[PDB]
Design a protein around this ligand. Sequence first.
Ligand code: H4A
Length: 186
Amino acid sequence: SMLDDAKARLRKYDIGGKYSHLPYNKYSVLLPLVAKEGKLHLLFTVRSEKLRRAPGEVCFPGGKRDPTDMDDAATALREAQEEVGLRPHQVEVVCCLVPCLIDTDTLITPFVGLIDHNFQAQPNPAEVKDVFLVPLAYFLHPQVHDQINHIFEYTNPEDGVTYQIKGMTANLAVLVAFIILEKKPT
Ligand SMILES: O[C@@H]1C[C@H](c2ccccc2)[C@H]2C[C@@H]3CNC[C@]31N2
């Protein structure tokens, strides 16, 4: 099946806990995979303005580890619940992808999660201004704009609204698309 095929591909790139004990400032992100209309999609947030860290940007759900988190996957799930109301029974964490090093003292750990078909996003307006889906296949042939910095523009065919996706978020989206969609019969 489509979902079993995706999880089996993703498992080959799981690094597990290999890098999780190193002494960094620690953040996790959840890359949430949603099946709709026979295709895979990724779920993105638009961050609120009132936030000190990173206002108005397109990002995956996530944030800073705290002392309650049992492990780095727990951080990602805690933060996804607070931002969009995703509950634990509604997500299966499939793997941990290559972490991202930033600013010399920070390590960001990405987890891929499969999302239950009955989940419906409840944006928390104190953290998130918007929540939207992008088909995974988009990231193999994106609409690119140069700010030189590469920026993707995605227009939702439902309402004509355009979103800009860039930086680590765009890099991780392309990676997940390559892992899941490369070399597939039609
Ligand atoms: O907040 C996250 C994590 C990263 C981060 C960088 C520096 C300090 C803290 C955190 C970057 C890259 C991520 C893209 N979405 C916002 C985002 N900023």
